[PDB]
Amino acid sequence: IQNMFQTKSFVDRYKYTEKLTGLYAQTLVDYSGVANTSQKPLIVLDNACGIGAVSSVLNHTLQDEAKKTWKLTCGDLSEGMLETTKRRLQDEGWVNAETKIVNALDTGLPDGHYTHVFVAFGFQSFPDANAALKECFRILASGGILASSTWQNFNWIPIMKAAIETIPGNLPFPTQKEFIALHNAGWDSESYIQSELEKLGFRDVKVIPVPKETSIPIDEFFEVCMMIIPYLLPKFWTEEQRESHEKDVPMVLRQYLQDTYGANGQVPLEAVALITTGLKP
Ligand SMILES: Nc1ncnc2c1ncn2[C@@H]1O[C@H](CSCC[C@H](N)C(=O)O)[C@@H](O)[C@H]1O
């Protein structure tokens, strides 16, 4: 049995999906205070780092003096994700950085080691977010900061649903709220997040909704859809529906996007992410 995040097909399209998660990488780094903090040296984990969105921002945002003494660990469960991150580390010239297989549910990392742990769009992807959150608390030093981003709303699932509705068969498709809660519910709620962090002993917890709007060419948006739809069909369609229609999804998506946004058009991306910070005493 495969994990979706470890398949080459998924990793290879993730650069298009990073156009969506990357909307909040600068937000998360800047809201964490890592560029202004009194903690020194910086010991940073990019947890569930993907292809390195947060790590890339950190390397472009932090002072040279701070990078002389910091250590950055880019952690992920997926060997394929880390292979891509490692190429980016080399290409962008990150300093004092390393990739490492890190299971967010059981990191193997030391108690009280990190000044900062970033979890950019990980908690709604982990099998159990609470276990991952407890690990974050364990591995942070006194005074350490957890900074996370999670989805509250976004328009791309509704766009895909509208495309799917142009197929005969009245085919099911998740709502945004269903999609974001497939693994862990609650991470679209400020009050849930605050309560969960506080129950573990985090203090000074802040949860801020941040709206973003941009646009992406239809051909790049198509790749995002193609990365996600195949993992939803076994859950939302019957076997007969898949036999009848799965092969038609690419054409339907192309046609919907061209018809709606233009043959050389741009898809509006609109989202709200919750940007959470908490302090370990
Ligand atoms: N148990 C686990 N431990 C660590 N990473 C995990 C994990 N389960 C899934 N992941 C990783 O979680 C990531 C979610 S996508 C987010 C990637 C990146 N932080 C960004 O902002 O773009 C993927 O890279 C996936 O491989």
Author numbering: 7 to 287
Please give the exact wording used by the authors of the publication that reports this structure:
We and others have shown that A. fumigatus effects dithiol gliotoxin S-methylation via a methyltransferase, gliotoxin thiomethyltransferase A (GtmA or TmtA) located outside the gliotoxin gene cluster. GtmA consists of two domains, a larger ‘upper’ domain containing a Rossmann-fold involved in binding the co-substrate SAM and a smaller ‘lower’ domain that changes its relative position to the upper domain in the three crystal structures described here. apo-GtmA seems to be highly flexible, as indicated by the higher B-factors. In agreement with Duell et al., who have recently published the structure of a GtmA–SAH complex in the same crystal form as described here, the cofactor binding site of GtmA is located in the upper part of a cleft between the two domains built by helix α1, sheet β2 and loop regions connecting β1–α2 and β3–β4. Our data suggest that GtmA methylates dithiol gliotoxin by a non-processive mechanism.
